[PDB]
Amino acid sequence: AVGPVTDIHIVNKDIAPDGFSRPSVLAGGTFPGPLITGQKGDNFKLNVVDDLTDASMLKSTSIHWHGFFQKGTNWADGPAFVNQCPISTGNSFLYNFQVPDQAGTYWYHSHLSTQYCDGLRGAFVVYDPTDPHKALYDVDDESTVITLADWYHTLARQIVGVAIADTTLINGLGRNTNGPADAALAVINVEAGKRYRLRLVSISCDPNYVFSIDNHDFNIIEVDGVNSKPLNVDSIQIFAGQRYSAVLNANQPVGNYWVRANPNLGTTGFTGGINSAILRYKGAPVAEPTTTQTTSTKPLQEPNLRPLVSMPVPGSATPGGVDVVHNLILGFSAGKFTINGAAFTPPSVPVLLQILSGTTNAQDLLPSGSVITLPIGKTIELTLAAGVLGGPHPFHLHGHNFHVVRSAGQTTPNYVDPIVRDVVNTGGTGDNVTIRFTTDNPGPWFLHCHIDWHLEAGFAVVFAEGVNQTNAANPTPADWNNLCNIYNALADGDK
Ligand SMILES: *[C@@H]1O[C@H](CO)[C@@H](O[C@@H]2O[C@H](CO)[C@@H](O)[C@H](O)[C@H]2NC(C)=O)[C@H](O)[C@H]1NC(C)=O
Ligand SMILES: *[C@@H]1O[C@H](CO)[C@@H](O)[C@H](O)[C@H]1NC(C)=O
Ligand SMILES: [Cu+2]
Ligand SMILES: [Cu+2]
Ligand SMILES: [Cu+2]
Numbered sequence: 001a002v003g004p005v006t007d008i009h010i011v012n013k014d015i016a017p018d019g020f021s022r023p024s025v026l027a028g029g030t031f032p033g034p035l036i037t038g039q040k041g042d043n044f045k046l047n048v049v050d051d052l053t054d055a056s057m058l059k060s061t062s063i064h065w066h067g068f069f070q071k072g073t074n075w076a077d078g079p080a081f082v083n084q085c086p087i088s089t090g091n092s093f094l095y096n097f098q099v100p101d102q103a104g105t106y107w108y109h110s111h112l113s114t115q116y117c118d119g120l121r122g123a124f125v126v127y128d129p130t131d132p133h134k135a136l137y138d139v140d141d142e143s144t145v146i147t148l149a150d151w152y153h154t155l156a157r158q159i160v161g162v163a164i165a166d167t168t169l170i171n172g173l174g175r176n177t178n179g180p181a182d183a184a185l186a187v188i189n190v191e192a193g194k195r196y197r198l199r200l201v202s203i204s205c206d207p208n209y210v211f212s213i214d215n216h217d218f219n220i221i222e223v224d225g226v227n228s229k230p231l232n233v234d235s236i237q238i239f240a241g242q243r244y245s246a247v248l249n250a251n252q253p254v255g256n257y258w259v260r261a262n263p264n265l266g267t268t269g270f271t272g273g274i275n276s277a278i279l280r281y282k283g284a285p286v287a288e289p290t291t292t293q294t295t296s297t298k299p300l301q302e303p304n305l306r307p308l309v310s311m312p313v314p315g316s317a318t319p320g321g322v323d324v325v326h327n328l329i330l331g332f333s334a335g336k337f338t339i340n341g342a343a344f345t346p347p348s349v350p351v352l353l354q355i356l357s358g359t360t361n362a363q364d365l366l367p368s369g370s371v372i373t374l375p376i377g378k379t380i381e382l383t384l385a386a387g388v389l390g391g392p393h394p395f396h397l398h399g400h401n402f403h404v405v406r407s408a409g410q411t412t413p414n415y416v417d418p419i420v421r422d423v424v425n426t427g428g429t430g431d432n433v434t435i436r437f438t439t440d441n442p443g444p445w446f447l448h449c450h451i452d453w454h455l456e457a458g459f460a461v462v463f464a465e466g467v468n469q470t471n472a473a474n475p476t477p478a479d480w481n482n483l484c485n486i487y488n489a490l491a492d493g494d495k
Contacts, residue, residue, distance in 0.1 A: 001034065001035040001036065001037040001125075001142050002028075002034045002035070002036055002037070003036040003037050003038050003042075003044060003046065004036075004037075004038035004039075004042040004043065004044045004045065004046075005043075005044070005045040005046075006036075006045075006046060006047070007047045007049055007092075008027050008028060008033070008034070008036075008046055008047065008048050008049065008063075009027070009028060009029070009049045009051050010025065010026070010027055010048060010049065010050050010051060010052055010061050010120060011025075011026055011028075011029050011051045011052065012024065012025060012026075012051075012052055012053055012054045012057070013026050013029050015031055015119070017031055017151060017167070017169050017172055017173060017174065018151060018166070018167040018169070018173075018174055018175060018176040018179050018180075018183055019175075019176065019179040019180035019183040020153050020166075020167075020176065020179060022153060022155065023054055023056065023057065023118075023155065024057070024118055024119035025052060025054075025057045025058075025061070025110065025115055025118045025119045025120045026119045026120065027063075027108075027120055027121075027122055028122075030172070031119050031121075031149075031169075031172050032121055032122040032123065032147050032149065032171075032172055032203060033108070033120065033121060033122030034122060035122060035123050035124070035125065035142050035145060036108060036122065036123070036124040036125075037124070037125050037126070037127065037142075038099070038126055038127070039103075039126065039127050039128075039129060040099065040100075040101075040102065040103040040126055040127070040128045040129070041098075041099070041100055042098070042099060042126070043096070043097070043098050044065075044095065044096070044097050044098070044099065045094060045095075045096050046063075046065075046094070046095040046096075047092055047093075047094045047095075048061070048063050048087060048092060048093050048094075048095060049092045050087045050088065050089050050090065050091055050092065050093075051089070051090075052089050053089065055493055055494070055495070056155055056157060056158070057115060057118040057155060057156065057157065058086075058112060058113060058115050058157075058495060059088070059089035059494055059495060060080075060086035060087060060088055060089065060112060060487065060490070060495055061086060061087050061110055061112055061115065061120065062078050062079070062080045062084055062086045062087060062110065062111050062112045063078050063095065063108055063109070063110060063111065063120070064077060064078025064079060064108065064109060064110075064111035064398075065077075065078065065095070065097070065106065065108050065124060066106055066107045066108060066109065066124070066241060066396075066422075067102070067104075067106040067107075067224060067225050067243075067422050068097065068099055068102060068106065069101075069102065069399055069400065069441060070097055070398075070399060070441075070443075071399075071440075071441050071473075072473055072474060072475075073096070073097040073098070073474065074352055074399070074441075074442070074443030074444065074445075074470070074473070074474040075352060075474055075476045075477070075480045076095045076096065076097045076480075077398055077399065077443075077445070078095075078111040079111045079398070079446050080111060080112040080113070080346060080350075081346035081347055081348070081349075081350050081351070082346075082350060082351045082352065082444055082445075082446055082462055083350060083351070083352050083443075083444065084350055084352070084480060084483050085350055085353075085483040085484035085486075085487040085488070086112050086483070086487055086495075087483065088483075088486045088487050088490055088494075089494060091486060092479075093479055093480070093483065094477070094479055096477065099126055102126060102225055103126045103127065103128035103131070103225070104125075104126060104128075104222050104224075104225035104226065104227070104243070104245070105123070105124075105125055105145075105199040105200075105201060105222060105224075105225065105243040105244070105245055106123075106124040106125070106126065106225060106243065107121065107122065107123050107124050107147075107201050107203055107241070107243070108121070108122055108123075108124050109121040109122075109203065113156075113157075113456060114156040114157065114205070114452050114453065114455075114456050115156065116205060116452060117150075117152060117156040117163075117205040117452055117453075118155060118156045121149070121203040122147075122203070123145050123147055123199070123201045123203070125145065125199060127140075132227060132308060133197075133221045133222070133227065133230075133245075133247075133308075136195065136197075136219070136221060136230065136247050137195040137196060137197040137247050138194045138195045138196070139190075139194055139195070139196045139197065140196070140197035140199075143188070143189060144188075144196050144197055144198050144199055145171075145199045145201065146170065146171060146188065146198055146199065146200050146201065146259075146277075147169075147170070147171055147172070147201045147202075147203050148168070148169075148170060148200070148201070148202050148203065148204060148209045148211065148238065148261050149168070149169040149170075149172070149203045149204060150165035150167075150168065150169075150204045150205050150206055150207050150263070150266075151165060151166060151167040151168070151169050151174070152165060152166055152205075153166045153167075159453075162390075162453075163205075163206060163453045164265055164266050165205075165206060165207055165263060165265065165266045166266065167179070167266075167274070168207075168209070168261050168263055168266075168274065168275045170185075170186045170259060170261055170276070170277035171186035171188075171277065172186070173185055173186040173277070174186070174274065174275070174276070174277070175272060175273050175274045175276070176274065177267040177271070177272065177274050181272055181273070185273060185276060185277055185278050185288070186259075186277035186278065187277065187278045187279075187280050188259060188277060188278065188279045188280070189280055189282065190248070190250040190279060190280070190281055190282070191250060191281065191282045192250050192251075192254055192281055192282070192283075193250060193251070194250050195247055195248065195249050195250070196247065196248045196250065197221070197245050197246075197247055198218070198245065198246045198247070198248050199243065199244075199245050200236065200238060200243060200244045200245070200246055201243050202238045202239065202240055202241055202242050202243070203241075204239075204240040204241070205240065205451070205452040205453065206240060206265070206451045206452065206453060207240070207263035207264050207265050207266065208237055208238060208239040208240065208263070208264050208392070208394070208425070209237070209238050209261040209262060209263055209264075210235055210236070210237050210238075210260075210261070210262040211235065211236045211237075211238055211259075211260065211261050212234065212235040212236070212259075212260045212293065212296065213248065213257055213258070213259050213260070213279050214257045214258045214260070214279075214289065214291035214292060214293055214294070215252050215257055215291060215294070216234075216248055216249075216251075216252060216257065216279070217232065217233065217234040217248075217298070218232070218233055218234070218236070218246035218247060218248055219231065219232050219233075219246065219247045220233055220236070220244050220245065220246050220247075220300065220305065221245045221246075221247055221308075222243070222244060222245035223242075223243070223244060223305055223419055223420075223421050224242055224243050224401070224421035224422045224423060225243065225401070225421075225422070226307060226308075226311075226401060226419070226420045226421060227307065227308035227309065228305050228306060228307060228308055228419065229305075229306040229307070229308055230247070231300070231304055231305055231306075232298060233246075233298050233299060233300040234296050234297060234298045234299070235296035235298075235299045235300065236299075236300045237299070237300060239392070239394035239423060239424075239425045239450070240394045240423070240450040240451055240452075241394065241396055241422075241423045241450040242394070242421070242423045244300075250281060252281075253281075254281040254282070254283045254284050255281055255284045255289070255291075256278055256279070256280050256281075256284050256285070256287060256288065256289040256290075256291070257278070257279040257280075257289050257291050258270070258276050258277075258278065258279075258289045258291050258293070259276060259277040259278060259279050260275060260276055260293060261275055261276070261277075262275055263275065264392075270293075273288060301407075301409075302404060302407040302408070302410075302419060302424075302425070303407050303410050303414065303418070305419035306417050306418075306419065307417065307419060307420055310417070311403070311417075311420050313403045313405060313415045313416070313418065313436060314379040314380075314403070314436050314437065314438050315379040315381065315436060316415075317415035317416075318415075319381075319413070319434070320381060321381075321415075322378075322379040322380060322381040322436060323375070323378035323379045323380070324374060324375065324378050324379070324380045324381070325380075325381045325382075325383075326372065326380070326381070326382050326383075327382075327383045327385070328340060328382055328383065328384055328385075328461070329341065329385075330384060330385065330386065330387075330388045330393070330426070330459075331388055332388050332389055332390070335457075336457050336458040337388070337390075337449070337454050337457050337458045337459030338458060338459075339370070339447075339459065339460065339461045340369075340461070341369070342367075342369035342370045342458075342461070343370075343457070343458025343459075344367065344370045344448070344455075344458045344459070344460035344461065344462075345367055345370075345458065346367075347366040347367050348488075349366065349484070350484065351365065351366075351371065351444040351462050351464065352443065352444050352470070352474070353484060354366060355444065355464065355467055355470045355471070356470065356471055356474075356476065360467050360468055362464070362467070365462075365464055365467075370460070370461050370462060371444075371461070371462045371464050372461055372462070372463055372464070373463075373464045373465075373467050374439050374463050374464065374465045374466070375439065375466070376439050376440075376442055376465065376466030376469050377438075377439060377440070377466075378438065378439050379436065379437075379438050380436060380437050380438065380439060381405075381434060381435070381436050382402075382434070382435050382436075382447075383406075383432055383433065383434045384424075384426045384432075384433045384434075384435070385426075385431065385432045385433075386408070386426045386427045386428050386429065386430075386431040386432075386433065387428065387429045387430075387431075390451070390454060391426065391427070391428050392408065392425050392426060392427050392428055393425075393426045393449045393451060393454065393459070394423050394424065394425050394426070394449065394450045394451065395423070395424055395426055395433075395447065395448070395449055395450070396422060396423045396424075396446075396447070396448060396449075396450045397422060397435070397437070397445065397446075397447050397463075398445040398446045398447070399441045399443060399445035399465070400422070400437045400441065400445065401420045401421060401422050401437065402420065402421070402422070402424075402435040402436060402437040403418050403419075403420050403435060403436045403437070404418050404419055404420070404421060404424050404433070404434075404435055405418050405434045405435065405436055406432060406433055406434035407424070407425075407427075407433065408424075408425045408426060408427025408428070408431045408433055409427060409431065413434060423450055439465050439466060441465060441466075441473075442465055442466030442467075442469035442470045442472070442473035442474065443465060443466070443470050443473060443474055444462050444463065444464045444465070444470070445462070445463050445465055446460055446461075446462060446463075447460065447461050447462075447463055448460035448461070
């Protein structure tokens, strides 16, 4: 692991995580990138050094630290042309932020176009020295982090039509249905009688995964950074960018057990050991499991998740019982995804810079139709009624957690004790996923589908939260101040 203070080099490397070699964009020269760690209350100083030379995956870059509120450091959030201009090749940029009030399981990824699909993604764990759940497990370290990733044989910018993941990678390793069958599988090591905090991280660009481990079950204790009441489950559907801590008791006979991550698209199932990794008990033979996937009798359902500590729902217990309601219309037309009829396209001047430079009138913010101002200090309700093609769409809000007052597949809202998280499945026809939060964080924040192909195709809006408090809230460093000057000076071939 690295952090809280570290350089992170962004490099090109040809890799073959399923036996198929291709160019990639990697943090620290590995897929996934290095695990970043720190403690609650740390000042993260993450010096991102852009060493990229391959124009086919972009030489520029920008990194988002997924799930962190970035209060007072909106400039460090990552989204290109919302919060910064990209870092240019041969340059560095220091992401300098604090995490005073968060601890849990997070991740990081490129937030420039579809570049994270080309490899720039990794896990990020913030430990809590007084974690209320600490006595529920024995082992919690780099070896208990499990990343689930989609992998494409075609470069992101060379995809024609609808992207379909070729291979599921667990901790960077996996077999392709038409690939070498001797391609290495990831191994998760346990010892009989010990309990493990499995930090399950979706670093997916698109598919959701149904995660299970043969003959084992879990207690979920954390959801997207938020401590939960322990919830006993035996399978976990995890959407793009979601995280869970799932405590596993190594209470089965010493042996090898299949770890399964079944995608919703591409090649499904487990023939030849695809979509699989290995849980190996100390003392077991070094071999593939022979175990059977038994029926999930207690699958995770989002409405069953409850915050560990009381987190009252903002507003009153009825639809629209808040200061500000936006019933967002999620659609698709003219070859692009739309929110309230508008497809997001990045502006030349980052939204934050527009505001800081003096553009504080809602009507003047660019891109026109894709920026919604929110007043500061107010309760907000968003609905995200589903049905639009390409689903199920997992929506993500930057700068915030939110209460999921109505989940996909849930008819009646819960205004008492719904889970709080940062990525939510919006479901399908008939669903009307509803989320609430309070505007306590001045700055422009993305709301978008975390299927990265859909973001690129316009499925996003920017919430310009507390526009007239944004300058005061977010003093910017000299290196941020110069990013657009450097980037705009680049030749087209060096972007
Ligand atoms: C999703 O739920 C919201 C309520 O939370 C619905 O919004 C209501 O829509 C009706 C019909 O247009 C309006 O008369 C109400 O004023 C709206 N209520 C609020 C509180 O804003 C919305 O229609 C639902 N969407 C779908 C597709 O069913
Ligand atoms: C910010 O304040 C200015 C000056 O009062 C006003 O014209 C503008 O509408 C405000 N912007 C927002 C987004 O509230
Ligand atoms: Cu993310
Ligand atoms: Cu995010
Ligand atoms: Cu989507």
